Amino acid sequence: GITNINCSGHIWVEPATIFKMGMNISIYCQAAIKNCQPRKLHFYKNGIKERFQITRINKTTARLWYKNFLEPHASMYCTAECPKHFQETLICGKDISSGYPPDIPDEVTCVIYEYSGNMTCTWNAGKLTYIDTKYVVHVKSLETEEEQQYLTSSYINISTDSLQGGKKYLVWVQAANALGMEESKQLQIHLDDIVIPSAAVISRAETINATVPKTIIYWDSQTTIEKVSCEMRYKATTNQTWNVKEFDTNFTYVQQSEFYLEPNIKYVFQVRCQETGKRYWQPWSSPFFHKTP
């Protein structure tokens, strides 16, 4: 009628309506008009009539062929010229998609930002998929052997409240789209070893005019974790090497690092911290510049 399409025939695609990008494809259109043997058969891509690579193989069926189809989406529909009509007769249409099968997800990592209360699991998804690819995250307890699954489109936050059965778990990721499906290797975690303390930030940078110029660096974090190791990098912007110092800091008070440096040069400063001995670190803080007197 007016609010719906009434197909008068059907259309199909080889190899399939969803195919690997860059492949040759053939689109077949078979008409089914009551009292009309079609004079000609047209194809439209995104409302644009196609003029090439169309062959009248059958009096009622037509084939459109594309070499190296690169569009990720395309709306196809075909029509028929009927002698008793001044209008083109709609046959049927179909949306075709192109993409790639998903890679085997690797670099699976699960961490718990301290006060976030939920565990953030990420991974490397691999090649571009272009098509709707869904990800299933499996979580299994090394103790009670019970397995939970979680669906997502990007990454996921899993609440620690749902992690009741033990503190040792196995985590792997399944990636799936129309063209394929792959699975990652199992990653085991210990909920005590995958915690990352709250962000550590640099406050100021003061230089003292005394015997030797001291560049005091003020930085602090709001973490309840006790055993914490940190690292700080400092380089002259003209230079291209990184100098680093290690500290086992106590965040009860704001930290003060005393550096003996050279005057009248630009500098850069970054910090990252971890629970001592644990596997994961913080990301490097945003670069903090400071010219000396």
Binding site: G1, I2, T3, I5, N6, Q87, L90
Partner: protein
């Protein structure tokens, strides 16, 4: 009076309707649904020049029903889903101009490829409706407005 605002906005509508879809008649395809529901300006709906001099209330009752009917479609998923219709696109302005003009009178599933063909069908059927609507407003502002 109020007839001038309805005349100016309807003038913009006929511009926006054809501007949204400049396809010619032979381009329009047809499908096996020959049999007939959609509100049309029927014969004797009081929208002829004599009908407005006798009583303009009858013609506006049908035009009001049509403007909210086609507005219901520009708000449907047909005109909002994939492929996305741009809001500032000339098709998007038609929606607000339809609701605004409708206010002055009296104070479902679909797949992305079907929407292209459906959108074509609605706009053409709308164009014939906006045409006769802009005629009664032009006649009203030129005859009943000065009085």
């Amino acid at each position: 009076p109020a007839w001038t605002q309805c005349q100016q906005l309807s003038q913009k509508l006929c511009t926006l309707a054809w501007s949204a879809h400049p396809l010619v008649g032979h381009m329009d395809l047809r499908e096996e649904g020959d049999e007939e529901d959609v509100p049309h300006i029927q014969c004797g709906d009081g929208c002829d020049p004599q009908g407005l001099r006798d009583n303009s209330q009858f013609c506006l009752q049908r035009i009001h029903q049509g403007l909210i009917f086609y507005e219901k479609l520009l708000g449907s998923d047909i005109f909002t889903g994939e492929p996305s219709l741009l809001p500032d696109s000339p098709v998007g302005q038609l929606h607000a101009s339809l609701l605004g003009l409708s206010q002055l009178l009296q104070p479902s599933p679909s797949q992305p490829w079907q929407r292209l063909l459906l959108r074509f069908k609605i706009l053409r059927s709308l164009q014939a409706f906006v045409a006769v609507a802009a005629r009664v407003f032009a006649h009203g502002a030129a005859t009943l407005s000065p009085g």
